[PDB]
Every structure is written in C-alpha cells, then in structure tokens.
C-alpha cells in the first residue's frame, strides 16, 4: 500500500507543466502506479481546464479550421512512461558499477535536472548527499529505510535541502529506484 505520495506543490507544477523533464518523469511514473495521486492530478487539471474555458478567445488566421481538417486522418515494474526510457526489461539497461553492489543507469532527458535508475542490493545502502535543490525517489522494486520512514514499491520520497540522508535498502529483494535531481 502506497503511503508516500507526490507533494501538492509538485502535483501543481506537473499539472501546470512547468516541471523539468526529469522530475516529470518521476512524478508521472508514480501517477501511473498510484491512483490516489492520479485522482489528485486530475482535480488539479480541472483547475486548468476551467481557466482554459474562461479565457477570452483569440481568433486564428482564416482557413485554420479548413487547413487542419485537411491534414486529419480518418516489464510490470517499469510502466507509466519510464518504459520509454528503458528497453524491454530492467535486467539489460546500461548499468555502471559503483560503490560495492550499487549500480546506476542515467536516463536521457531535456531540462537541467537529471534522472537515473539506481540498483541497490538488499543490505547495502545508497550513499547520499543533501542536494542544492530537490531530489525525488520512486521505489520500483523492494524497498529501503530512511529512519523517518520506510519506502516500498511505488512509494515516493521527497528530500529537501534541510535533510540528513541515511538510506539502507531492505534485505529480501534488490531495491531498484528511479531518482531525479536538480
């Protein structure tokens, strides 16, 4: 049961579309794993649709309708969009080897925020630093313990600069996550 969601502020940014590709990637992968946050985004989208509908129209150049009508045609743990950044299954992505059994595979994105898949085996821990901005983590498999809480499959953590990081992954299965930093 997902007990950790995307903050209202991140959901508002996602609904506004002002988010950087990386963060949008994590937020939306959660959204396709968590119906609760999916319903929240929806209410937020509703605000946009209303502002939309209540905006003074601006005429298009003549012929626009006619123009457009002419050109009209008559892995279960990596699913929302994440699947587009990774091939068939998670076992064969371009994995780098790092500090012991941790492995990471950077994902290609626009914007100035970075996304990557972290592979942390049971028992080891993700070494980490309190970033300058905001870090988003989404567990896709297994889980890991921050002390302030736990995070299992589908749960998302939102670190802030005020933080202290200490995460050790649960023993059992390997905890694979999706992270994004700015």
């Amino acid at each position: 049961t997902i007990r950790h969601h995307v903050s209202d502020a991140l959901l508002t940014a996602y609904a506004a579309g002002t988010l950087s590709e990386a963060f949008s990637l994590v937020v939306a992968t959660h959204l396709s794993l968590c119906d609760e946050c999916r319903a929240r985004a929806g209410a937020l989208d509703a605000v946009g649709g209303s502002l939309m509908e209540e905006t003074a129209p601006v005429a298009l150049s003549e012929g626009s309708l006619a123009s457009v009508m002419a050109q009209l045609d008559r892995d279960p743990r990596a699913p929302a969009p994440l699947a587009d950044y990774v091939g068939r299954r998670l076992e064969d992505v371009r994995w780098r080897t790092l500090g012991g059994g941790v492995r990471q595979a950077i994902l290609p994105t626009g914007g100035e925020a970075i996304a990557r898949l972290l592979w942390i085996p049971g028992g080891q821990a993700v070494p980490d630093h309190g970033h300058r901005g905001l870090e988003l983590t989404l567990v896709l498999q297994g889980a890991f313990r921050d002390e302030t809480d736990r995070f299992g499959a589908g749960d998302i953590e939102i670190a802030d600069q005020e933080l202290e990081h200490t995460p050790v992954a649960e023993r059992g299965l390997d905890c694979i996550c999706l992270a994004a930093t700015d």
């Binding site: 508002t12 996602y14 609904a15 506004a16 579309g17 002002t18 988010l19 950087s20 590709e21 949008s24 990637l25 939306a28 992968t29 959204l31 396709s32 119906d35 609760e36 999916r38 319903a39 929240r40 929806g42 209410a43 937020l44 989208d45 509703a46 605000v47 946009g48 649709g49 209303s50 502002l51 939309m52 509908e53 209540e54 905006t55 003074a56 129209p57 601006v58 005429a59 298009l60 150049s61 626009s64 309708l65 123009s67 457009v68 009508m69 050109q71 009209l72 045609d73 008559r74 699913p79 929302a80 969009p81 587009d84 290609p108 994105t109 626009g110 914007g111 100035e112």
Partner: protein, 166 residues
C-alpha cells in the same frame, strides 16, 4: 445546445469520425487554446501553431477521452500543457499510463453526469474568486482553497470503476 454538448461531440468522433463534430469542437476550443497559450507567454504565431496541433491530437486521441474523469475542456487543457517546452524537455511532458475504455464499453451515464456536475461546481467557484486569489491561481498555471476535494473524490471513484472493467 447539442452543438455545444462537448461530451456528446467527443463520442461522435470516437465512434464515427464525425468531421462536423470536430469542426464544432474546433471552432470553439481552438481560439481558447490559443488565447490561453498566449497568456502563458507565447507569441500569437506560435500559439496558433500549437492550437492547431492540440486540435489534431484531440482527433487522434479521441478514444482516450473519458467523460467520467474530466470535462472536455480539461482534457484539451491536458493536451495543451503537455506540448514541448525547450528548456524543460526534448519531446513532451512525460505522462502516465493510458487508462481508457475500449470500444466494448463506456463509463456509467451517472458517473459521467456527476463528474460533469462537480466540474461545473469548480468552474463556478473559480469564477467568483476575489481578484487576488484568482491571480494566485493564474500565476501558477502561467509562469511562477478550492473545492478540488469534491472533484478529486469523483475521479478517485470513477477510476476504481474503470479498473474493474479492464
């Protein structure tokens, strides 16, 4: 006005590739999508470019529209904001997995009637905000306490239904 019955017209496109219906939609939403994108800070020419593109997408992804989870204007807003934003992305805002009703079925008339109701309530609330809270809202959707509760609840509710069907 049945020519204005957006939901109905979207079903027209979904099931019969009703081009008149599409024109009906376009003549209403295109100019709004344009004005909206300009308030967002786009240049007329680039707005009209996007407007047209958004409308073409409305046609292509017509089947993805679920009248029990959003109004047509919200769905369209969804397609306008997911456009390319250079400094933030290469192609489009990454969006969640597509949950749609297949051609075999459709959401309950009731769930739809209610979704549209709560939406109309949000619209109304939005409209009467004193000009200060109304700007707070706009600044968010343009650059940078509403009844979202009720709407959030229906979608949550409508979403569960969609799940049993699949």
């Amino acid at each position: 006005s049945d020519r204005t019955d957006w939901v109905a017209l979207m079903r027209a496109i979904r099931d019969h590739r009703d081009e008149a219906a599409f024109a009906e939609l376009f003549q209403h939403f295109a100019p709004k999508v344009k004005g909206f994108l300009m308030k967002s800070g786009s240049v007329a020419s680039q707005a009209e470019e996007c407007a047209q593109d958004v409308m073409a997408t409305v046609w292509q992804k017509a089947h993805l529209f679920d009248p029990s989870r959003a109004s047509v204007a919200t769905w369209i807003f969804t397609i306008a904001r997911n456009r390319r934003i250079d400094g933030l992305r290469k192609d489009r805002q990454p969006e969640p997995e597509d949950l749609f009703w297949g051609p075999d079925s459709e959401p309950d008339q009731a769930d739809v009637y209610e979704m549209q109701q709560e939406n109309a309530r949000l619209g109304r609330a939005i409209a009467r905000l004193p000009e200060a809270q109304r700007a707070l809202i706009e600044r968010a959707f343009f650059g940078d306490g509403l009844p979202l509760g009720t709407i959030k609840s229906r979608i949550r509710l409508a979403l569960d239904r969609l799940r049993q069907h699949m």
